[PDB]
């Protein structure tokens, strides 16, 4: 996994993550794809650091949307979308 | 607008509820909210109605009562009915 792959997977989620509402089907599909790449501990740590940079990338990101994205998409997300996540604990 | 692929993808988490009953999940209610939000114009609503109709007929074990009660169980006012047999021309 690479940070560009992660960015591409999270792109459809930016409207939901910065404006609220509901994640679209495209957003949930991208998150599902990225979750499928974060299997191994090293994949999980790398994807986590990429997701952290991406989260800090988007302005006025709403943490309620980030926290509720896994339940709104039906995913047990192995890498949380946080600006402040310590990826070593993943 | 809305496309049949969007309708399929948003209603997919609802298939367990639509075929077995019970309660709709969080993902199902989220997809139903998204579909409600994409059906803005009356033309969007008729297009969505035909897509949802195809999706409903896709499962031969679909419970029409669960389809009818899905919006209320989710707390959503869905502007397009979910029916296997609806004539989508008669909707507004
Ligand atoms: C069960 C709720 C029925 C919705 C009909 C009332 C109209 C409000 C939303 C209808 C379709 C959305 C279009 C819009 O709000 O511009």
């Amino acid at each position: 996994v690479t940070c560009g792959q992660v960015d591409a997977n999270l792109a459809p989620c930016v409207p939901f993550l910065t404006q609220g509402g509901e994640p679209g089907a495209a957003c949930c599909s991208g998150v599902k794809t990225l979750n499928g790449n974060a299997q191994s501990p090293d994949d999980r740590k790398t994807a986590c650091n990429c997701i952290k940079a991406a989260a800090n990338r988007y302005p006025n990101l709403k943490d309620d949307a980030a926290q509720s994205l896994p339940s709104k998409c039906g995913i047990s997300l192995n890498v949380p979308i946080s600006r402040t996540i310590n990826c070593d604990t993943i």
Side-chain angles (χ1 to χ4, degrees), chain A:
Chain A
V1 69
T2 72
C3 283
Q5 183 165 79
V6 163
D7 295 337
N9 287 343
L10 283 170
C13 294
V14 171
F16 169 69
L17 286 169
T18 60
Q19 296 173 51
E22 301 294 335
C27 164
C28 290
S29 177
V31 174
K32 190 72 193 189
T33 294
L34 154 64
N35 203 47
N37 296 331
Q39 306 277 53
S40 76
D42 191 16
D43 291 338
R44 285 178 65 153
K45 290 196 184 329
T46 306
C48 175
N49 285 297
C50 292
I51 292 173
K52 183 174 171 184
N56 287 291
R57 202 183 284 132
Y58 316 128
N60 43 70
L61 172 97
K62 277 129 188 49
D63 184 52
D64 289 344
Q67 294 165 306
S68 63
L69 183 136
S71 62
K72 283 182 186 282
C73 286
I75 310 182
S76 181
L77 190 56
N78 299 126
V79 277
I81 302 155
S82 168
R83 280 169 175 208
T84 69
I85 176 85
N86 192 322
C87 295
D88 297 331
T89 77
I90 296 302

